[PDB]
Design an enzyme around this catalytic site. Structure first.
Site, PDB file in Angstrom:
ATOM      1  N   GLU A   1       7.208   9.348  32.911  1.00  0.00           N
ATOM      2  CA  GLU A   1       7.040   8.004  32.369  1.00  0.00           C
ATOM      3  C   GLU A   1       6.436   8.013  30.959  1.00  0.00           C
ATOM      4  O   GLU A   1       6.874   7.256  30.103  1.00  0.00           O
ATOM      5  CB  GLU A   1       6.169   7.152  33.297  1.00  0.00           C
ATOM      6  CG  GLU A   1       6.898   6.664  34.537  1.00  0.00           C
ATOM      7  CD  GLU A   1       7.986   5.618  34.326  1.00  0.00           C
ATOM      8  OE1 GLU A   1       8.319   5.306  33.161  1.00  0.00           O
ATOM      9  OE2 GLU A   1       8.508   5.117  35.340  1.00  0.00           O
TER      10      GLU A   1
HETATM   11  C1  BLG Z   1       6.164  -0.348  36.757  1.00  0.00           C
HETATM   12  C2  BLG Z   1       7.011  -1.435  36.158  1.00  0.00           C
HETATM   13  O1  BLG Z   1       6.530  -2.272  35.414  1.00  0.00           O
HETATM   14  N1  BLG Z   1       8.305  -1.445  36.483  1.00  0.00           N
HETATM   15  C3  BLG Z   1       9.288  -2.368  35.954  1.00  0.00           C
HETATM   16  C4  BLG Z   1      10.364  -1.621  35.210  1.00  0.00           C
HETATM   17  O2  BLG Z   1       9.750  -0.956  34.138  1.00  0.00           O
HETATM   18  C5  BLG Z   1      10.373   0.229  33.694  1.00  0.00           C
HETATM   19  C6  BLG Z   1      11.109   0.009  32.393  1.00  0.00           C
HETATM   20  C7  BLG Z   1      11.210   1.433  31.842  1.00  0.00           C
HETATM   21  C8  BLG Z   1      11.317   1.451  30.330  1.00  0.00           C
HETATM   22  O3  BLG Z   1      10.327   1.229  29.640  1.00  0.00           O
HETATM   23  N2  BLG Z   1      12.519   1.717  29.827  1.00  0.00           N
HETATM   24  C9  BLG Z   1      12.762   1.841  28.395  1.00  0.00           C
HETATM   25  C10 BLG Z   1      12.564   3.267  27.949  1.00  0.00           C
HETATM   26  S1  BLG Z   1      12.956   3.543  26.244  1.00  0.00           S
HETATM   27  O4  BLG Z   1      11.783   2.843  25.517  1.00  0.00           O
HETATM   28  O5  BLG Z   1      14.161   2.813  25.959  1.00  0.00           O
HETATM   29  O6  BLG Z   1      12.893   4.964  26.066  1.00  0.00           O
HETATM   30  N3  BLG Z   1       9.936   2.110  32.267  1.00  0.00           N
HETATM   31  C11 BLG Z   1       9.300   1.254  33.346  1.00  0.00           C
HETATM   32  C12 BLG Z   1       8.860   2.083  34.539  1.00  0.00           C
HETATM   33  O7  BLG Z   1       9.879   2.976  34.970  1.00  0.00           O
HETATM   34  O8  BLG Z   1      11.389  -2.474  34.707  1.00  0.00           O
HETATM   35  C13 BLG Z   1      12.061  -3.202  35.751  1.00  0.00           C
HETATM   36  C14 BLG Z   1      13.203  -3.954  35.098  1.00  0.00           C
HETATM   37  O9  BLG Z   1      12.753  -4.802  34.052  1.00  0.00           O
HETATM   38  C15 BLG Z   1      11.036  -4.082  36.453  1.00  0.00           C
HETATM   39  O10 BLG Z   1      11.641  -4.760  37.614  1.00  0.00           O
HETATM   40  S2  BLG Z   1      11.696  -6.349  37.652  1.00  0.00           S
HETATM   41  O11 BLG Z   1      10.402  -6.871  37.319  1.00  0.00           O
HETATM   42  O12 BLG Z   1      12.099  -6.632  39.001  1.00  0.00           O
HETATM   43  O13 BLG Z   1      12.698  -6.647  36.666  1.00  0.00           O
HETATM   44  C16 BLG Z   1       9.919  -3.225  37.041  1.00  0.00           C
HETATM   45  O14 BLG Z   1       8.957  -4.063  37.651  1.00  0.00           O
END
Ligand code: BLG
Ligand code: ZN
Ligand code: ZN
Length: 277
Positions: free
Chosen positions: A83
Site C-alpha cells: 500500500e
Molecule cells: C482502505 C480504503 O480506504 N479503501 C478504499 C479504496 O481505497 C484504495 C484506493 C487505492 C488507491 O489509492 N489507488 C490509486 C493508486 S495510484 O495513486 O494511482 O498509484 N488504495 C486504497 C487502498 O487499497 O478505494 C475504494 C474505491 O474507491 C473504496 O471503496 S468504496 O468506499 O466502497 O468505494 C475503499 O473503501
C-alpha cells in the site's frame, strides 16, 4: 489455526519468524501466472522490500501484535508494504493516506479525523485498528474469503459484490480469480501473495531480509497539547525525525490537533512519563 500467548510470542527470534508463524493463506495459493508476474517484480526491484522493511521496522511489531490478538492472517502485516512501502506520509492520486491507504470517505467512516493539522489516517495506532476492523468486516461480508476481502479493501465492497452478481447471472465462478475487477484490484491480491511467498522462504529466491528484533519499538505516553515535538525530543534526548516518523498524523510537526498522546521509543518512555508530570 493455532494461537500463542504473550509469553510464547516473546520466544520468536525475530519479527520475520513471528510473522511467518501466523501466515494463514499459504496453503491456499496455487501456481497462478498472475502471482508469478508479481513475484518477478519483487525480485527485479529488490531495494523496494529492503527500504520498506527498514521503515517498517518502526511499526511492524505493533502491526503483528494487533493481527495476532485478532487471529487474523499475518500476511496482512505485509499489506502496508504493498500500500505505502511502510511510509505513513504516502498519499495516492485518490488521496489515500497512511500505512493502510485510507481514502478520505473511508477514513471518515472509521472516525479517523482529518483537520488542517491532524490526519487520523496517518496515525499508526488508529489507522491500524481501523484497517484490521475493515478487513475483518469485509472478510465476514464475503463468507470468510480473505481474497475477496482484500479485493474489496482495494476496490470497494460494491464493486466486488456487483462483479459477483454479474458472474452469477452468467453462470461463471465467483471466486476472486474469476472476477472482472479493475486492473489495480486484479494485481492487488497476487502482489500480496507473491510478497508473502518471498517472505516465507527468501533464500529460495536469492533474497536476504534485514533482521528485525522481536521487541516493541515504541510506547504511547500522555502529552498535553501545549508541547511541540521539538520540546519532547529535547527533554528526552530523542531524534526529532524519528519522533515524527512515530507520530506522522501531525502535519508540519504541529501537534495542536488530535489525541494528547505521542508514541515514543520504548527505552525513553518511562523517563518521559515521569518528566511530563
Ligand atoms: C482502505 C480504503 O480506504 N479503501 C478504499 C479504496 O481505497 C484504495 C484506493 C487505492 C488507491 O489509492 N489507488 C490509486 C493508486 S495510484 O495513486 O494511482 O498509484 N488504495 C486504497 C487502498 O487499497 O478505494 C475504494 C474505491 O474507491 C473504496 O471503496 S468504496 O468506499 O466502497 O468505494 C475503499 O473503501
Ligand atoms: Zn482459535
Ligand atoms: Zn505457532
Amino acid at each position: 489455526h493455532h494461537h500463542h500467548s504473550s509469553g510464547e510470542n516473546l520466544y520468536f527470534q525475530g519479527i520475520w519468524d513471528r510473522m511467518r508463524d501466523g501466515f494463514q493463506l499459504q496453503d491456499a495459493i496455487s501456481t497462478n501466472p498472475r502471482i508469478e508476474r508479481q513475484r518477478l517484480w519483487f525480485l527485479s526491484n529488490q531495494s523496494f522490500l529492503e527500504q520498506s522493511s527498514a521503515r517498517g521496522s518502526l511499526y511492524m511489531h505493533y502491526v503483528v501484535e494487533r493481527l495476532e490478538e485478532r487471529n487474523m492472517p499475518l500476511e496482512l502485516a505485509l499489506l502496508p508494504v504493498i500500500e505505502s512501502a511502510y511510509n505513513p506520509f504516502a498519499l495516492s492520486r485518490s488521496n489515500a493516506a497512511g500505512l493502510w491507504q485510507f481514502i478520505p470517505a473511508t477514513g471518515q467512516h472509521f472516525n479517523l479525523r482529518q483537520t488542517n493539522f491532524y490526519d487520523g489516517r496517518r496515525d499508526i495506532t488508529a489507522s491500524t485498528n481501523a484497517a484490521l476492523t475493515y478487513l475483518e468486516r469485509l472478510h465476514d461480508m464475503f463468507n470468510g474469503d480473505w481474497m475477496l476481502a482484500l479485493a474489496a479493501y482495494n476496490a470497494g465492497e460494491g464493486t466486488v459484490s456487483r462483479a459477483i452478481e454479474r458472474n452469477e447471472k452468467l453462470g461463471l465462478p465467483t471466486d476472486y480469480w474469476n472476477l472482472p475487477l479493475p486492473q489495480e484490484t486484479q494485481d492487488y491480491v497476487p502482489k500480496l501473495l507473491a510478497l508473502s511467498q518471498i517472505v516465507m522462504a527468501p533464500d529460495s529466491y536469492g533474497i536476504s531480509l534485514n533482521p528485525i528484533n522481536n521487541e516493541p519499538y515504541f510506547q504511547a505516553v500522555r502529552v498535553k497539547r501545549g508541547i511541540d515535538l521539538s520540546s519532547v525530543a529535547a527533554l528526552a534526548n530523542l531524534d526529532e525525525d524519528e519522533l515524527y516518523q512515530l507520530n506522522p498524523a501531525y502535519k508540519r510537526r504541529v501537534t495542536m490537533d488530535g489525541p494528547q498522546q505521542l508514541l515514543v521509543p520504548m527505552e525513553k518512555a518511562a523517563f518521559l512519563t515521569a518528566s511530563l508530570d
